Ligand binder design. Structure first.
Ligand code: MG
Ligand code: MG
Ligand code: MG
Ligand code: MG
Ligand code: MG
Ligand code: MG
Ligand code: MG
Ligand code: MG
Ligand code: MG
Ligand code: MG
Ligand code: MG
Ligand code: MG
Ligand code: MG
Ligand code: MG
Ligand code: MG
Ligand code: MG
Ligand code: MG
Ligand code: MG
Ligand code: MG
Ligand code: MG
Ligand code: MG
Ligand code: MG
Ligand code: MG
Ligand code: MG
Ligand code: MG
Ligand code: ZN
Lengths: 155, 25, 99, 118, 60, 81, 127
RNA sequence: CCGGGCACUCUAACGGGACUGCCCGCGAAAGCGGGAGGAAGGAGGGGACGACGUCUGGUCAGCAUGGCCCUUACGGCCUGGGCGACACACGUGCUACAAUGCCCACUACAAAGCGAUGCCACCCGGCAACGGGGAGCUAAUCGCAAAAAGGUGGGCCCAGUUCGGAUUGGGGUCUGCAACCCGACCCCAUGAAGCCGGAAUCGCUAGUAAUCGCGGAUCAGCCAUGCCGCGGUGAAUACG
């Protein structure tokens, strides 16, 4: 991305809940190119957010996503001394991706044998706040706390 | 998987036919 | 009921050898239904570009075999004769069968 | 229960637990399952000793398993060795016995690596 | 290849399994095309002068 | 594996089938390692070629379906340093 | 008596026939949801209907060939977008901003000599 | 399938078609942003194409060729062997270590190529490889052909396992004069290492990367997981 501003890949909205967030999330669940499996997993998940919990599974997702969204992070930078760790804020775009990423990877670490139940529980625990993928968002922010000394080196 | 000659998936890969991939259509 | 099979390599000479026959038939005889371009069958050769060894850097050529079919429905002995000795092909091959 | 010497399969599923016997699996199983008119889909945990003894009797009688099976493949190879035979030599030195370049990994047959200097 | 080698290619009888292709412009036993009887350097050489009928270089 | 088959070369096949019905038996050098062995081979002493020389190989009843080059190995080894 | 449209995606091509009715859709001698059962991107093809407000106005009989199940679906979507643009082509007005009037130029990129997949290249060795 | 038509899909030749030519912004211009076009733009995406030259680069084993060199051999024919060796070391790969996964049954959707010294439908024998028979096609006209993933349905229940199929034993099929060394394939038994890989390291910016099958060249057969190609589904991410 030397010359350009590298404009953002844009996705077609969902065919059920009609939301881009969902598709962009669906993609991350997709192993080796299978979209069909990706949705059939996710859609079974919000089935689980229904019989289990009386709440509305869409609403959980935006919430569970907004809780696992990191507010600040520590980027490497090189200077008139050695390499450092400098705290800055995640751009809106960036916060997106990380939350979607961490969500899934956390999900797969959950012990539940079936894929949908994994993302189900995680996304629930995520929204209620106690989720493993949240432990990350938190943690990342905690790094940029302790390094606030180096926060004068930001760009 | 693609190396079990004693399976459907395997046979297809090796390109061959047999008791595990009998030829019918 | 008797049809003509046209083949060849250059479609410059192949096309131009259908069009003479169309009017050595239409004007020159009974009804003949226009040239139909049967699909081209393509032989391809891909080959290492140097004498010894550079396994990347190929060059490939191809030999294009083009087909063209014209149907002629009814016999006129001027069609038979004009299409016999007035042959003016070059690298084209022609065929005819009664059946 | 127990078949072919001791070899107890348990729980699981009956056509599967049949694989766990020496000399048997896949085919030789799903065959003797209907040949004894037994449901394969059932579980070896529970079934009538009826369908149990019909089942051991077939198998243990039909073909050779376990001890005598291993004893036969033993003396078969003993036969290839000591007859001075080629394949015999490849058994004698523990090297790969069919086709099989040995300049690089034979490892399954060769053992783990024993490295040396350049 | 050598002479008696380009020759023996032609002497085809005695166990036709032994008949192997050979280039008509080389003697080259390797990478000979059934269709042309030429080998792969020669195919590239003759195709480039136009002396291979209706044989054009491909691009796509 | 052949079966309608069992290929043996006719050259030694002669000299062996003879050494039954001639009544007499001795040492016979052949290049044919492609051939199968027995029945009337057993007890004959056949010299098989490895590419280098002719190896004496004594013959018995469990050598039966085995080609003549099984018993004449082609490569010299004795391991490494 | 009817309206027509043409669309194609990746060597797959679609014939679209629109003759008003309950909203019944026929594909290659089949119910729409039978042929496409289990494929979750299916309903995206008739997306220009939903945005044209015509629901149970039109039935559909549709032939399609080439490519594969899930790229044929994009070929139908252009069919319906070129058929709906026939009945009162004031429906061009909002179709094209939605982007249902453009054909996908996107196709399989070929293979290159020296490579493996036409971009994907063999592992570098160096030593 | 028939009549019928070729309108469509398509097949293949010929043109058309966007040139920053048009709208505001900037600017001195070239250009650049932005707008509406349009199927398409800012060289539309991909080929083919590779300056004077450099590496005393590669190739005397494709061929050519100056020079030196052997002349019952440094030439020539054959039978057999070797190029396939195995204490080990490196490069490119393939199949995996599983549950977004394995197996079984059913159900769909491609493109590009090849074949009347061949491709072989369909029927019978065989668990099968294959073998008998045997119709069509000089092939948009018959055959390779089943595409695979996917889809549906049921099974497995986290286990070195219905994971994974290396190794070995026995039984066979085929090509071929001939499968010991060295073939490919089928069945039965055997079921190993392996539970995501130290230091280190590669590819890829979109219909790409991943992943899934398919065809051809060479070719009797084949050690092809290779190579050259074809379509199927189809991400992520570029602050800088
Ligand atoms: Mg398996
Ligand atoms: Mg081998
Ligand atoms: Mg070897
Ligand atoms: Mg010479
Ligand atoms: Mg040969
Ligand atoms: Mg050759
Ligand atoms: Mg096309
Ligand atoms: Mg591809
Ligand atoms: Mg390479
Ligand atoms: Mg290299
Ligand atoms: Mg201007
Ligand atoms: Mg240029
Ligand atoms: Mg010279
Ligand atoms: Mg020379
Ligand atoms: Mg010599
Ligand atoms: Mg020789
Ligand atoms: Mg070699
Ligand atoms: Mg090396
Ligand atoms: Mg490989
Ligand atoms: Mg272990
Ligand atoms: Mg061998
Ligand atoms: Mg495990
Ligand atoms: Mg690794
Ligand atoms: Mg690039
Ligand atoms: Mg292939
Ligand atoms: Zn040549």
């Amino acid at each position: 991305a030397r010359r350009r501003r590298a404009e953002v890949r844009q996705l077609q909205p969902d065919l059920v809940y009609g939301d881009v967030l969902v598709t962009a999330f669906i993609n991350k669940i997709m192993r080796d190119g299978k979209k069909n499996l990706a949705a059939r997993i996710f859609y079974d998940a919000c089935k689980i957010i229904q019989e289990k919990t009386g709440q509305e599974p869409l609403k959980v997702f935006k919430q569970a996503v907004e809780n696992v969204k990191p507010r600040m992070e520590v980027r490497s930078r090189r200077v008139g001394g050695a390499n450092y760790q400098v705290p800055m804020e995640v751009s809106p775009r960036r916060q997106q991706s990380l939350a979607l990423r961490w969500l899934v990877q956390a999900a797969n670490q959950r012990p539940e044998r079936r894929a949908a139940v994994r993302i189900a529980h995680e996304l629930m625990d995520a929204a209620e706040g106690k989720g493993g993928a949240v432990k990350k968002k938190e943690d990342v922010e905690r790094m940029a706390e302790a390094n606030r000394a180096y926060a004068h080196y930001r760009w | 998987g693609k190396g079990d000659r004693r399976t459907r998936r395997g046979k297809i890969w090796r390109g061959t036919y047999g008791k595990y991939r009998p030829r019918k259509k | 009921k008797i049809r003509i099979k046209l083949r060849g390599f250059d479609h410059k000479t192949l096309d131009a050898s259908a069009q003479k026959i169309v009017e050595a038939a239409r004007r020159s005889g009974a009804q003949v239904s226009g040239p139909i371009p049967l699909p081209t069958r393509v032989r391809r050769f891909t080959v290492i570009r140097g004498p010894f060894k550079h396994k990347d850097s190929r060059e490939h050529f191809e030999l294009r075999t083009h087909n063209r079919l014209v149907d002629i429905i009814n016999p006129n002995r001027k069609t038979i004769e004009q299409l016999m000795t007035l042959d003016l092909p070059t690298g084209v091959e022609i065929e005819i069968k009664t059946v | 229960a127990r078949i072919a010497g001791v070899e107890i399969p348990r729980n699981k599923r009956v056509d599967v637990a049949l694989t766990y016997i020496y000399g048997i699996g896949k085919a030789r199983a799903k065959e003797a399952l209907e040949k004894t008119g037994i449901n394969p889909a059932t579980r070896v945990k529970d079934l009538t000793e009826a369908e149990v003894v019909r089942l051991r009797e077939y198998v243990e009688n039909t073909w050779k398993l376990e001890g005598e099976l291993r004893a036969e493949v033993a003396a078969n190879i003993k036969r290839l060795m000591d007859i001075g035979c080629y394949r015999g030599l490849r058994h004698r030195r523990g090297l790969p016995v069919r086709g099989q370049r040995t300049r690089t990994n034979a490892r399954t047959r060769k053992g783990p690596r024993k490295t040396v200097a350049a | 290849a050598r002479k008696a080698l380009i020759e023996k290619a032609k002497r085809t009888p005695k166990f036709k399994v032994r008949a192997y292709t050979r280039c008509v412009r080389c003697g080259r036993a390797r990478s000979v095309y059934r269709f042309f009887g030429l080998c792969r350097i020669c195919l590239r050489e003759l195709a480039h002068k136009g002396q291979l009928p209706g044989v054009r270089k491909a691009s796509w | 594996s052949l079966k309608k088959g069992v290929f043996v070369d006719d050259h030694l096949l002669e000299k062996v089938l003879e050494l039954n019905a001639k009544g007499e038996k001795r040492l016979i050098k052949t290049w044919s390692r492609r051939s199968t062995i027995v029945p009337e081979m057993v007890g004959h002493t056949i010299a098989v070629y490895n590419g280098k020389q002719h190896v004496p190989v004594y013959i018995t009843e469990n050598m039966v379906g085995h080609k003549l080059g099984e018993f004449a190995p082609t490569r010299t080894y004795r391991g490494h340093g | 008596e009817q309206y027509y449209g043409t669309g194609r995606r990746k060597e797959a091509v679609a014939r679209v026939f629109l003759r008003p009715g309950n909203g019944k859709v026929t594909v290659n001698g089949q119910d729409f949801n039978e042929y496409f059962q289990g494929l979750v991107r299916a309903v995206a093809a008739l997306e220009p209907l939903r945005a044209v407000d015509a629901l149970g106005h039109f039935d559909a009989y549709i032939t399609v060939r080439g490519g594969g199940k899930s790229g044929q679906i994009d070929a139908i979507k252009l069919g319906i977008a070129r058929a709906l643009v026939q009945y009162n082509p004031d429906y061009r007005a909002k179709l094209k901003p939605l982007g249902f009037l453009t054909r996908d130029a996107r196709v399989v990129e070929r293979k290159k000599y020296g490579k493996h997949k036409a971009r994907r290249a063999p592992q570098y060795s160096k030593r």
